[PDB]
Amino acid sequence: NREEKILNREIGFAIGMPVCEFDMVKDPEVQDFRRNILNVCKEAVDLRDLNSPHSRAMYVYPPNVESSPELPKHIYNKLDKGQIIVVIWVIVSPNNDKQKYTLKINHDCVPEQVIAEAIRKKTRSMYQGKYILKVCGCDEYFLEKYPLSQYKYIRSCIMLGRMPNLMLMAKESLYSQLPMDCFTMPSYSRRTSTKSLWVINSALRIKILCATYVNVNIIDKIYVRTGIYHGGEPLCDNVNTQRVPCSNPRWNEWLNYDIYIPDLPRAARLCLSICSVEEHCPLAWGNINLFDYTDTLVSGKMALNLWPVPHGLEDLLNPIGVTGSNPNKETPCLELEFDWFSSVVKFPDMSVIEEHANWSVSREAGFSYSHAGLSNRLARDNELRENDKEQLKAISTRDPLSEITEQEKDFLWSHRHYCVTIPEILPKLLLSVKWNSRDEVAQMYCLVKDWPPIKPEQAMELLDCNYPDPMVRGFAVRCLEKYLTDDKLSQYLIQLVQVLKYEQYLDNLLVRFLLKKALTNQRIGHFFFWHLKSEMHNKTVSQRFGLLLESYCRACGMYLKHLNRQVEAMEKLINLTDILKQEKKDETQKVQMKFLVEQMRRPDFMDALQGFLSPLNPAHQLGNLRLEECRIMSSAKRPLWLNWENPDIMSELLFQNNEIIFKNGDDLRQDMLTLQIIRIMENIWQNQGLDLRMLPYGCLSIGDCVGLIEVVRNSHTIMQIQCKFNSHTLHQWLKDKNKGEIYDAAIDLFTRSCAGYCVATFILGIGDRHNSNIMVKDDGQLFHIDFGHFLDHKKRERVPFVLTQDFLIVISKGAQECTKTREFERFQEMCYKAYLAIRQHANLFINLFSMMLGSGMPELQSFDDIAYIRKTLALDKTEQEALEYFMKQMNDAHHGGW
Numbered sequence: 038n039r040e041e042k043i044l045n046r047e048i049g050f051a052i053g054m055p056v057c058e059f060d061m062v063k064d065p066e067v068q069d070f071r072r073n074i075l076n077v078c079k080e081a082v083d084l085r086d087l088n089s090p091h092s093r094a095m096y097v098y099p100p101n102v103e104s105s106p107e108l109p110k111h112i113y114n115k116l117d118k119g120q121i122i123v124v125i126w127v128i129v130s131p132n133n134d135k136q137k138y139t140l141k142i143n144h145d146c147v148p149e150q151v152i153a154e155a156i157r158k159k160t161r162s163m164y165q166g167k168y169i170l171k172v173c174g175c176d177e178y179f180l181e182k183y184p185l186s187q188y189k190y191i192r193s194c195i196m197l198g199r200m201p202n203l204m205l206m207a208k209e210s211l212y213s214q215l216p217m218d219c220f221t222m223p224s225y226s227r228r229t230s231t232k233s234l235w236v237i238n239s240a241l242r243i244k245i246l247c248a249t250y251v252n253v254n255i256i257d258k259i260y261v262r263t264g265i266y267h268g269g270e271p272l273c274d275n276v277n278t279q280r281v282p283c284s285n286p287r288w289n290e291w292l293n294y295d296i297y298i299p300d301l302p303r304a305a306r307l308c309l310s311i312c313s314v315e316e317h318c319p320l321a322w323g324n325i326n327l328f329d330y331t332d333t334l335v336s337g338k339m340a341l342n343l344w345p346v347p348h349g350l351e352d353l354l355n356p357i358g359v360t361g362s363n364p365n366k367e368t369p370c371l372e373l374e375f376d377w378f379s380s381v382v383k384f385p386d387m388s389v390i391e392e393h394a395n396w397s398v399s400r401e402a403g404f405s406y407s408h409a410g411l412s413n414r415l416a417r418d419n420e421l422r423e424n425d426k427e428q429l430k431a432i433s434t435r436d437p438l439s440e441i442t443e444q445e446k447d448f449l450w451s452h453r454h455y456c457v458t459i460p461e462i463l464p465k466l467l468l469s470v471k472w473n474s475r476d477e478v479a480q481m482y483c484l485v486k487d488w489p490p491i492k493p494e495q496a497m498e499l500l501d502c503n504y505p506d507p508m509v510r511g512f513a514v515r516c517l518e519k520y521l522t523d524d525k526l527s528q529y530l531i532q533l534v535q536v537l538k539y540e541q542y543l544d545n546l547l548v549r550f551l552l553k554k555a556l557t558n559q560r561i562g563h564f565f566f567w568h569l570k571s572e573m574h575n576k577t578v579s580q581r582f583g584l585l586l587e588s589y590c591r592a593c594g595m596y597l598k599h600l601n602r603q604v605e606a607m608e609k610l611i612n613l614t615d616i617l618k619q620e621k622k623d624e625t626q627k628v629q630m631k632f633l634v635e636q637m638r639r640p641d642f643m644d645a646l647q648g649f650l651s652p653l654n655p656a657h658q659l660g661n662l663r664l665e666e667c668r669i670m671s672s673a674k675r676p677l678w679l680n681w682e683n684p685d686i687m688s689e690l691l692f693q694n695n696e697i698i699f700k701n702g703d704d705l706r707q708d709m710l711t712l713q714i715i716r717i718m719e720n721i722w723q724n725q726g727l728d729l730r731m732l733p734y735g736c737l738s739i740g741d742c743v744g745l746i747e748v749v750r751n752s753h754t755i756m757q758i759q760c761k762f763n764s765h766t767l768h769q770w771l772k773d774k775n776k777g778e779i780y781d782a783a784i785d786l787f788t789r790s791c792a793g794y795c796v797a798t799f800i801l802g803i804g805d806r807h808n809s810n811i812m813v814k815d816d817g818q819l820f821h822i823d824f825g826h827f828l829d830h831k832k833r834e835r836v837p838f839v840l841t842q843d844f845l846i847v848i849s850k851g852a853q854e855c856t857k858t859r860e861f862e863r864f865q866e867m868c869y870k871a872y873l874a875i876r877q878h879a880n881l882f883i884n885l886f887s888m889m890l891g892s893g894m895p896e897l898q899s900f901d902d903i904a905y906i907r908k909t910l911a912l913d914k915t916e917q918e919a920l921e922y923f924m925k926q927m928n929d930a931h932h933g934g935w
């Protein structure tokens with residue numbers, strides 16, 4: 038109990054709320070989550086102590102590897118006859134004298150071969166499984182037998198033409214530094230009739246009693262609008278109450294819905310709102326699951342605390358809004374009464390559903406020609422023609438925002454068994470289902486049950502707000518379990534954490550998958566913790582994420598202690614920036630910096646801000662602060678530029694100073710998503726042998742409009758260049774930074790990076806570019822900063838990155854008529870190739886954005902905001918028509934040239 042009390046305080050500090058607040062929650066679902074989720078905690082700990090110390094080392098330092106060992110042609114061609122020059126460092130003499138041994142080995146060498154070759158070279162100057170390779174400068178290790186080139190550091194070194202520097206370290210020097218953490222089960226581990234839904238022979242009705250806390254400006258006549266939803270799909274007509282004055286919100290009225298109680302799908306929800314009156318307007322909204330976590334249909338009296346309308350939603354109901362009561366009890370509260378059946382009504386078991394499904398398939402197989410003719414949703418087996426099979430393949434290639442007509446819905450459903458042969462059609466088939474028909478849904482269940490597995494990126498769509506059904510989401514998660522690699526889990530983690538908000542219940546298959554992975558991979562565990570923590574201010578998800586964080590913190594081990602260092606450092610930084618903006622905002626930079634340095638140097642603050650792991654990359658150790666290098670930036674929201682020593686023995690070989698931008702006041706979530714997408718686009722380009730180097734720098738939101746930005750070394754804004762002006766000033770600067778034989782490499786890098794950002798910003802519809810948000814590296818690498826805006830952030834498509842004379846001059850190597858040059862023609866060709874490459878992967882990009890609708894991002898609120906990408910990628914047009922469209926967008930913007 039003394040250890041439990043201390044641990045509870047550590048978790049309380051990490052989550053930012055006391056654990057006891059959970060213990061007080063009366064809700065049985067909350068207490069069942071807390072207890073039942075501990076098996077995932079147990080399993081994860083069991084896997085970590087399966088092959089100790091190695092399995093523990095693998096958890097803390099997982100291999101940072103690529104998804105595939107195969108190297109793209111242009112990347113393999115960068116190697117000398119398939120071989121790589123590698124530097125291996127050995128610390129041998131006292132006072133840590135560093136010895137280097139240059140090796141030329143095959144790119145696909147296992148670390149054990151790399152170590153033996155180093156020992157051979159060390160011996161040539163005068164066991165193999167008693168050492169490990171570590172990346173010089175950071176806590177990155179090569180613990181698993183992967184081809185060398187598969188580790189991201191090595192692949193990055195080949196792609197950039199940099200020398201890989203690895204340090205030989207004794208296994209026991211790492212192992213002894215890994216503490217044993219025994220996971221202890223918490224105190225809380227130790228805890229009429231019943232009829233099936235398909236037996237209740239009655240129509241659906243819900244009684245609306247009255248409303249409390251309806252404080253409005255005497256707004257006049259008010260009513261409650263209700264609807265039965267399955268995701269966003271209405272299951273019946275919307276039913277409103279009689280109009281009443283806001284001075285007395287009383288209805289005591291039964292609302293009858295056009296839906297049979299046995300027809301109710303598992304994910305059925307009641308969507309309601311208090312509206313005012315004809316200019317109708319919602320005032321407060323709220324959603325309810327018609328079945329609880331135990332599969333029980335709602336019965337009796339219930340009070341629902343409503344939510345405020347979001348600036349932009351003109352619609353009277355909010356089905357894609359959060360489901361459940363408002364944690365704030367000083368809000369419009371609507372009392373509702375549910376139907377009584379003199380027994381507990383439960384959703385039928387899978388065996389009842391399977392029996393009913395097989396009864397229907399059998400009944401349908403016996404249907405005569407004329408019977409099949411009564412419904413377009415009923416087709417015959419032998420009547421399936423090749424043209425129909427062709428139409429099916431065509432429908433399957435359409436994007437997730439392509440409208441499926443009622444005719445195609447009936448078509449896909451009648452050919453559902455053929456659909457199994459083309460399994461990627463599953464999301465379209467699911468939207469074709471009559472979710473308000475138990476016969477159809479029961480049959481869909483059995484098809485999902487045995488559905489062929491699909492690509493993890495295709496399965497992710499099935500986890501968004503369009504697919505609420507648990508059988509469907511279970512299938513999506515099973516595909517992620519079988520085919521999602523840790524690399525790709527890390528890449529899409531923000532979306533996967535987002536879609537948790539769409540789960541009906543706290544205890545679900547997705548959360549179990551995500552938690553097991555977070556507790557079996559510390560690299561995943563780290564970002565899992567921060568994505569959840571950053572949203573703990575948001576009362577729409579703070580209970581779910583709080584309980585999720587509590588389970589993670591109980592089983593993560595020693596990393597909780599390290600996370601508490603990062604949390605405390607972030608809090609001290611939030612504290613300082615908050616004082617500067619409320620108590621020192623009007624003072625001079627000199628005065629503000631004087632205050633900063635004095636507050637930072639306080640021993641309590643000084644220690645909290647030194648000797649912790651970078652939340653941007655936990656493999657990066659933040660040593661002592663370099664205060665002389667710390668400063669308040671002139672930028673909006675006055676961000677802090679912070680510098681730390683890299684305590685790593687071989688810091689000089691990576692970077693001797695870790696520079697991070699701490700910014701308080703701006704929502705860094707859109708930037709995080711844009712940067713994530715930029716990286717995905719780059720990966721797509723590289724795989725197709727199209728070397729357009731992007732700079733997706735690190736960015737992490739750590740709270741409500743608080744975050745970290747990775748500083749890019751040796752970079753300057755376009756304005757910073759020209760301020761030392763002619764159009765030749767930038768090209769003059771580049772020529773000055775890359776004199777002689779290396780000048781062409783810089784022009785090539787600029788052109789390539791420039792083509793990437795032209796295409797990326799045009800597709801995504803990023804905020805207008807200017808000399809202060811376009812940056813350039815000494816070597817010529819062009820990149821964009823400040824991704825605060827994207828998509829339709831105006832009210833018809835924009836070109837955010839318009840190439841001025843400055844950019845065209847660099848591309849054309851200093852020519853006057855830069856538009857009419859071969860260099861510019863090769864530049865245009867890179868844009869065309871890049872644009873069409875992304876167009877080919879549009880479903881992915883649409884899916885990545887759709888999974889982000891749950892998030893409170895102001896530019897990504899509806900599917901129509903995502904529609905912007907359908908327009909920029911010209912998906913309704915042909916490929917040549919799309920190329921023609923892009924050229925017109927470029928030609929109009931640049932007033933010619935394209």
Ligand SMILES: NC(=O)[C@@H](Nc1ccc2c(c1)OCCn1cc(N3C(=O)OC[C@H]3C(F)(F)F)nc1-2)C1CC1
Nearest residue numbers: 672676698700734746747748749752753754822823
């Ligand atoms: N050139 C410079 O002034 C300095 N180097 C620099 C500055 C800013 C960023 C950067 C590098 O790395 C790229 C990432 N980055 C991103 C941002 N920002 C951004 O995305 O929004 C505004 C701005 C800020 F102020 F928030 F950092 N700034 C930088 C150099 C003198 C030391």
